[PDB]
Amino acid sequence: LAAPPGELTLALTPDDKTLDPASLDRALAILAEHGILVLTGMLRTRLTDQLRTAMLDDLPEVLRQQDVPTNFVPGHVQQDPPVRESLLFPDVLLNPVVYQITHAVLGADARNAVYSGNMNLPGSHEQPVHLDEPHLWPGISHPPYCLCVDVPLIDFTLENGSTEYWPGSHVLNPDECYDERGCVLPAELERRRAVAPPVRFPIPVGSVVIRDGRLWHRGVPNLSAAPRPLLAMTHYTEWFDMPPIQLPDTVKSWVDGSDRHTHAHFVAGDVDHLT
Ligand SMILES: NC[C@H]1O[C@H](O[C@H]2[C@H](O)[C@@H](O[C@H]3O[C@H](CO)[C@@H](O)[C@H](N)[C@H]3O)[C@H](N)C[C@@H]2N)[C@H](N)[C@@H](O)[C@@H]1O
Ligand code: NI
């Protein structure tokens, strides 16, 4: 593919603060059927440039750690973006279109409880197909309780490790489908591949991906010369237990008391996001 598939894609400008009813209906219809929705033209260059720069500037500190935290296989580094006041942007944390969709899917009490990132390094390995958040009981069909909000901080290409997604996989929860790490058992993977094979496609910087937290996906090798930073948030239902995001009380004024909710603990000092 050369672009996000039309059936998963809704196009916007950074000026759009709400989806009209027909746009919201299509957004919800895509998330319900495919478990993944690509929103193009959401974020200004000004914001993505500063976040990209901050995360690449922090990568050296991350690679110096005694144990570099990875997801599954070499080269998929867990990296939190900074929570400096200067790098906490309302249009990223409290995006009005993102929360319009998450409010409609999860309810008005839904809250962001993740402010993290995935730095995919040059020469990274293939992750096993997994879900980031499990089904709440084995062998049970239930609606979503969490939505991953993924912000690419550079153009994602097939070369630099755009994520493999398995459309419609978010509703699959037969017995002995998942292991303790959330990896899909091989038997189920092959059966699914027959009827609905995975897709991988470019995603331009400025885009936002909203997906069911239970969607099957894998990180894949970054074959470029440059690390591929993703900023990651996750909206949960009110009743799902999550630790709070540590934020500086310098952002409490606009974060706390907003009707788009964040599970946050506000600290007096600077926060150390890296450990
Ligand atoms: N899309 C955002 C992020 O999603 C995932 O991070 C998740 C964990 O996966 C999840 O853990 C779940 O899975 C574990 C192992 O399967 C189980 O032990 C655990 N009980 C179960 O809650 C935590 N609750 C929250 C964390 N933010 C990815 N790792 C990461 O790449 C990505 O940035
Ligand atoms: Ni994952």
Side-chain angles (χ1 to χ4, degrees):
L1 302 172
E7 69 260 32
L8 306 185
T9 318
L10 194 76
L12 285 93
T13 78
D15 280 22
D16 291 306
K17 292 226 175 301
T18 194
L19 296 183
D20 63 305
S23 284
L24 184 56
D25 285 346
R26 186 157 167 282
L28 289 198
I30 293 166
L31 276 176
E33 184 179 357
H34 300 296
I36 173 169
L37 169 69
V38 181
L39 302 171
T40 58
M42 290 270 311
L43 297 178
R44 299 174 191 285
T45 301
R46 184 70 192 117
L47 303 194
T48 55
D49 279 356
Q50 290 179 260
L51 293 172
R52 184 205 64 241
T53 298
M55 288 199 77
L56 289 175
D57 288 343
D58 282 342
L59 184 46
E61 192 176 329
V62 179
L63 295 178
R64 285 193 300 273
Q65 294 176 277
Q66 259 294 353
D67 207 291
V68 177
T70 61
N71 302 298
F72 296 111
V73 297
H76 296 273
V77 173
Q78 323 182 329
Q79 185 181 324
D80 290 343
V83 291
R84 289 190 294 280
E85 194 283 332
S86 69
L87 291 169
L88 291 165
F89 302 121
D91 284 333
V92 176
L93 263 83
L94 300 187
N95 187 278
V97 165
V98 168
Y99 273 88
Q100 182 176 22
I101 294 169
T102 68
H103 283 160
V105 176
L106 298 181
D109 282 327
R111 63 217 190 130
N112 185 37
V114 177
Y115 194 67
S116 198
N118 296 74
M119 189 69 71
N120 183 349
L121 298 183
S124 56
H125 295 184
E126 190 166 34
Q127 296 184 324
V129 180
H130 64 277
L131 34 69
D132 285 351
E133 287 283 12
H135 301 270
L136 294 177
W137 312 262
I140 295 296
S141 292
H142 61 78
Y145 70 96
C146 60
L147 287 179
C148 292
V149 183
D150 291 343
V151 181
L153 295 182
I154 64 171
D155 286 341
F156 283 18
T157 69
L158 300 182
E159 193 169 65
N160 72 8
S162 202
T163 309
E164 179 178 283
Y165 301 112
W166 291 63
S169 62
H170 59 296
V171 304
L172 301 180
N173 189 28
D175 291 305
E176 284 143 24
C177 186
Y178 307 105
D179 70 12
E180 287 155 33
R181 299 166 306 146
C183 297
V184 185
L185 188 147
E188 296 304 329
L189 254 187
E190 301 325 330
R191 280 198 274 273
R192 184 58 185 183
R193 198 185 301 273
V195 287
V199 298
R200 210 162 77 81
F201 49 84
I203 305 170
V205 68
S207 303
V208 177
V209 178
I210 306 187
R211 58 188 181 79
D212 199 303
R214 304 170 293 169
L215 191 79
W216 304 356
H217 66 292
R218 57 158 64 146
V220 300
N222 173 3
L223 310 168
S224 74
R228 181 231 64 175
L230 176 79
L231 182 143
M233 296 169 295
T234 314
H235 291 200
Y236 291 86
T237 59
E238 160 271 322
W239 47 259
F240 197 75
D241 188 31
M242 284 301 279
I245 303 166
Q246 307 273 302
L247 298 180
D249 59 12
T250 49
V251 303
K252 184 171 150 139
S253 43
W254 60 265
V255 170
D256 197 60
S258 172
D259 63 30
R260 311 156 193 161
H261 293 166
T262 311
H263 187 39
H265 176 251
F266 306 92
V267 297
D270 309 0
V271 188
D272 188 13
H273 58 280
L274 294 183
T275 62

